[PDB]
Design a binder for this molecule. Structure first.
Ligand code: MG
Ligand code: MG
Ligand code: MG
Ligand code: MG
Ligand code: MG
Ligand code: MG
Ligand code: MG
Ligand code: MG
Ligand code: MG
Ligand code: MG
Ligand code: MG
Ligand code: MG
Ligand code: MG
Ligand code: MG
Ligand code: MG
Ligand code: MG
Ligand code: MG
Ligand code: MG
Ligand code: MG
Ligand code: MG
Ligand code: MG
Ligand code: MG
Ligand code: MG
Ligand code: MG
Ligand code: MG
Lengths: 258, 197
RNA sequence: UCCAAACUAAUUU
RNA sequence: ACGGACCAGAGCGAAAGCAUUUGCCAAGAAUGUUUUCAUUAAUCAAGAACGAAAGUCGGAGGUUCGAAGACGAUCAGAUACCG
RNA sequence: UACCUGGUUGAUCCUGCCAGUAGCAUAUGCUUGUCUCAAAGAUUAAGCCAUGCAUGUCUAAGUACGCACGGCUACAGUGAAACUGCGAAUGGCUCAUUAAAUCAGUUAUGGUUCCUUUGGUCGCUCGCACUUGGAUAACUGUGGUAAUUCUAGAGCUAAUACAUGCCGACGGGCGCUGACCCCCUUCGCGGGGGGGAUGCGUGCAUUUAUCAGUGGUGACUCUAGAUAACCUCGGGCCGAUCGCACGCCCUGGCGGCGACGACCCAUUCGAACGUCUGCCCUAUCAACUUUCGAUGGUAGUCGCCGUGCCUACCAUGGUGACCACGGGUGACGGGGAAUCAGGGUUCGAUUCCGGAGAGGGAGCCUGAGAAACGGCUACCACAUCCAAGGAAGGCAGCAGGCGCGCAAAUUACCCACUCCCGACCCGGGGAGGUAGUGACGAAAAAUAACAAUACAGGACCUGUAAUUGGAAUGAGUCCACUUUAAAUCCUUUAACGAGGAUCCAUUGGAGGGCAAGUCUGGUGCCAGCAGCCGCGGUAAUUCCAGCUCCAAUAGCGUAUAUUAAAGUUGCUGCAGUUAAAAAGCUCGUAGUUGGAUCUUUUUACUUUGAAAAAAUUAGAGUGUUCAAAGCAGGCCCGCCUGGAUACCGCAGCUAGGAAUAAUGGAAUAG
RNA sequence: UCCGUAACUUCGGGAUAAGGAUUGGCUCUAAGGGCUGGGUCGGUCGCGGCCGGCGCCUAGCAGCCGACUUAGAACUGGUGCG
């Protein structure tokens, strides 16, 4: 191309959006924002293909232009705003206050949280740098920036910020035994405690995570998101608590529910 | 136009490679600035990203550093005496990033005579032979201890011409900054100039 | 240890 | 020029090939070995040495035989067989 | 389904090919009732193109004095046009170019740019404001021209266009300078401790030198700090802008929310250039590259940056039988597709990802992004109007036409769905969607069923009939609903609609391979058939016909590419005494392969973990009426539930294993 | 001067094959040599030496001298230049 792409084909879309291949040729290419394109969830396919509030695309913008949708305490009107992990969608008219967290199969679950849980969120510390006059900064997995963070908060740690304030409330260090969620790869959505952070200089670091059944698995350090301190998750986990059943152990769960 | 691609080169083996696309715009090159000495003439080029880089076609005034006192003044360039890259850039008075230049020394004599009260390169009276109060006159006496410039560098102040060196890239930044040659780097370039004579 | 070459196109098992 | 008989389902040589006597020169297999070295090997594009007979080019020699050639026969023909 | 059959002979066993056989995909032939999906000018000509369309865009929120409309005093409110802004670099089409190139996996940018979006930052600088300047379009008015989305002259008038530019913060602080005062000593000299006027400088960004060693990294010449400065007139920043609601303090003075813009730092979408490994045929291509850069060093120039990218000065290198270089390709690469026991073989123009080009080349403007072609500028080729003066061109966009050919569709309707762009809830989209043409192909499935007789059978059951009987339905016709942007079709339901149920099933065959006749008539080595062996010269099981029969059936022949068959290319798996074939013999470098030995250092190997685009394939779940499909669905105010898993050569990464296979340690002990 | 050279061949030749470019003036720039001295402390008297403590040019400097030639570049002329 001579410049940046603007469309997105239907079959070339991300798998976890769960679009179908006979509705149209294209998929909603999400706008540029705080989340990556393969790691986001656009607002139109959340309101239309999950919640059934609208039936077409034009009925989504009739919701959004009436300013009924809030993201992170702020009104967003774009139908392809990239919403992502640990984000809070506040509809607030029906009073629902969603929080996007992956299920155990690796797609965004329609997950409801309590309307005082929607005051805050969690963020992974991606970068620490100082600025002019020696002022430290902090960059999250979202594109937001915090001036004057806590001196103990280092890279890959998880902070808890307040929406509508934008300041740091509390943080969790990346340590052994803390409670984390996997945000990428073949273990997308699984939850367990950190067993061992295996270091490799130059290349990627690998973290072994032990599930709450005895199962263990490993993932790169760039996909590990700490969600709890010790064994206590600081959010409300979805239905299943991040346990990946085998394909036999989810057959009988269907078979013992008929 | 002027392309700075790689695909017009032959391969490592010596095989001629065949082009697979027309020459793209991010592979452009532009003509050299060939910055001379004279009254200031600077052109700006719109470059990739919408940015601007300043290319200077004539420059007479620079910003050079004395180095061993952290004394940087804005002085005037007289001429070019040496160029390691091409001998015929000296004859046409072209200023490039490492060429050895020759500058007026009077901002460096004037600062030195004010910081040490000692004549430099002399065979008005107020800054040198001033009546100082004895607390102030005390302060100039520990500066008097370390006031000795090397013998190769006191020669330069008598002719009023320091031998200097460009450090910036004129024709990219539009300026000519650099530092004064001193020490073993001075006497290396001194005998190269004497050998060409 | 004398010589001694050739053989319907006219077809049906 | 040629080395009969002896001369063989015998020998030697990488193969082509190799036979009178004696001398000289260098080689080599097999056997023998309680010597020595200690894997130095096997097969091999490119490359290399050898390679009957006929043929080629120089010298020498030319007895026998003998392509080509010339005749005598035979033959329907016989520029072939035989002389 | 890991399959063979005919053909050399008088007969036999062989080697061996030819011929069958089965898909697949292109053309074609004959035929064709229904209905659901669906390819479709790639192959030859990346040949040439008439006409039309395919890209524009306005909110309460940049600029309305167009009465073009319009309500009751700077400006109501709509608002054409015009300026300004933004997009037009995406999409779409085609496969010519291109053989470590493109591309794929893998990594890097600690070697770079990045409009927008989102989050920071935006009184950090000591130095007319209650608003500054000029211009221009729309409009009006005079025109020119054969001509065009040509434009001239004159009068107006705007800004978030274009310029210019201040107050406030703002009290100073901090560095340097140092007049000067002051205190404690001192025989004195000297020495010691504060205050300090007046001057110079001061923030980010930029550029260079130097000093010190807040946070980070495997690793910085990183980030931050300190100092000396500089800061381009073709000029970095530091708001002369707009709308909502409008309150509050004592004319004044403050205040809520937005929009728009900003240098810079992140972020997002990327982009570009690098790392490692991987490609078809060819030796009747064996050496190639290099003072016209080939390989490297030093310094620069250029560039967004690393770099022989380029220049100067040097060095003489670099690549190659492990196939360089050269040539070819009926070569865009890949995901993939057809065939298939296991291995393979062939294909991939073609809807997804990546690349390329817009008649051929070349050069550029604008912009964040282009060497752009529904942008300019040339020249070549071609071609269009012309009053001969000139002007305009680019369908490998959708349609359409010509040409080329064995070979490929309507100059249809629509922004309703999918999404994209814009100032935008309103506009636009030949992207896309829907119809038409559609035996490319794929799924489903009519052309009769029954009963009684007449008869035949079988050990009460069954068959045969130009006999008979009323039962059942679609095809078709056809109202209406539904469907949808409006339709159409399907689905639904009235009305009709079957006896030769004339509402008629073809395509190939009948010696053998190979399912099916020694029937009848004609022809007489003729006409003809026949893939192969063959047939025909007067009783043709083979031709031409009739009768019968067979095969598969709304499909079936035929041509050609190709796969299996083919263990007839042989890795699995072939041969080489006489059938095709082992070089005359030996040496010999590459290459290939290498004896035994030990517990009973680097790799290869093996196992595992990551990270690996979907679609396709395998496969889970689910009654599209079934099936091909599809990702749906299911249960009585709503509730419940799916949208799995596997596989993804090699290379690179990770942790276990230590047999096998390489390799390494102490012999002048260095 | 710099490039570039076929058929044919007794492999020597053909060959100055053929074919093309360049050439002035001026101002510079590189490159190509030769002769001398590398003597550290008077250890210390027959401003010079007599025998040796005293030292590291050793990747060569420094002085003087000297021909001719090749290459490159800028400028310059009514495109002229063997
Ligand atoms: Mg004898
Ligand atoms: Mg050989
Ligand atoms: Mg012979
Ligand atoms: Mg002779
Ligand atoms: Mg005779
Ligand atoms: Mg026979
Ligand atoms: Mg065959
Ligand atoms: Mg495109
Ligand atoms: Mg990026
Ligand atoms: Mg070709
Ligand atoms: Mg292009
Ligand atoms: Mg064309
Ligand atoms: Mg172009
Ligand atoms: Mg076009
Ligand atoms: Mg067709
Ligand atoms: Mg079919
Ligand atoms: Mg019919
Ligand atoms: Mg047959
Ligand atoms: Mg085959
Ligand atoms: Mg087979
Ligand atoms: Mg065979
Ligand atoms: Mg044979
Ligand atoms: Mg032999
Ligand atoms: Mg062994
Ligand atoms: Mg001649």
């Amino acid at each position: 191309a001579r410049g940046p792409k603007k469309h997105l084909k239907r079959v070339a879309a991300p798998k976890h959006w769960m679009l179908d291949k006979l509705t149209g040729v294209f998929a909603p290419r999400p706008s540029t924002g705080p989340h990556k394109l393969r790691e986001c969830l656009p607002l139109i396919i959340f309101l239309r293909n999950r919640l059934k509030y609208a039936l077409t695309g034009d009925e989504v913008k009739k919701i959004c232009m009436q300013r009924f949708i809030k993201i992170d305490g702020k009104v967003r009107t774009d139908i392809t705003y990239p919403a992502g992990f640990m984000d809070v969608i506040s509809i607030d008219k029906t009073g629902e206050n969603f929080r996007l967290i992956y299920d155990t199969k690796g797609r965004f679950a329609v997950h409801r949280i309590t309307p005082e849980e929607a005051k805050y969120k969690l963020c992974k510390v991606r970068k620490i740098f100082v600025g002019t006059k020696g002022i430290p900064h902090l960059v999250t997995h979202d594109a937001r920036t915090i001036r004057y963070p806590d001196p103990l908060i280092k890279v890959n740690d998880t902070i808890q910020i307040d929406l509508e304030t934008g300041k740091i409330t509390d943080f969790i260090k990346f340590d052994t035994g803390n409670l984390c969620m996997v945000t990428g790869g073949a273990n997308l959505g699984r939850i367990g405690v950190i067993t061992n952070r295996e270091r490799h200089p130059g290349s990627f670091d690998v973290v072994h995570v032990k599930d709450a059944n005895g199962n263990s698995f490993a993932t790169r350090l760039s996909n590990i998101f700490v969600i709890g301190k010790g064994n206590k998750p600081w959010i409300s986990l979805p239905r299943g608590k991040g346990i990946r059943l085998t394909i036999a152990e989810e057959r009988d769960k269907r078979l013992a529910a008929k | 136009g002027i392309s700075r691609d790689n695909w017009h080169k032959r391969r490592k083996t010596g095989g001629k490679r065949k082009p697979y696309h027309k020459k793209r715009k991010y592979e452009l090159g532009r003509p050299a600035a060939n910055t001379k000495i004279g009254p200031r003439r600077i052109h700006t080029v719109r470059v990739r990203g919408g940015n601007k880089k300043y290319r200077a076609l004539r420059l007479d005034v620079g910003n050079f550093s004395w180095g061993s006192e952290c004394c940087t003044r804005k002085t005037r360039i007289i001429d070019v005496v040496y160029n390691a890259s091409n001998n015929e850039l000296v004859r046409t008075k072209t200023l490039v990033k490492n060429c050895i230049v020759l500058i007026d020394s009077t901002p460096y004599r004037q600062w030195y005579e004010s910081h040490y009260a000692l004549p430099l390169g002399r065979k008005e009276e107020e800054i040198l032979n001033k009546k100082r109060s004895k607390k102030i006159q005390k302060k100039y006496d520990e500066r008097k201890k370390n006031a000795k410039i090397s013998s190769l560098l006191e020669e330069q102040f008598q002719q009023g011409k320091l031998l200097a060196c460009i450090a910036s890239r004129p024709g990219q930044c539009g300026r000519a900054d650099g530092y004064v040659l001193e020490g073993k780097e001075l006497e290396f370039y001194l005998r190269k100039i004497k050998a060409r004579k």
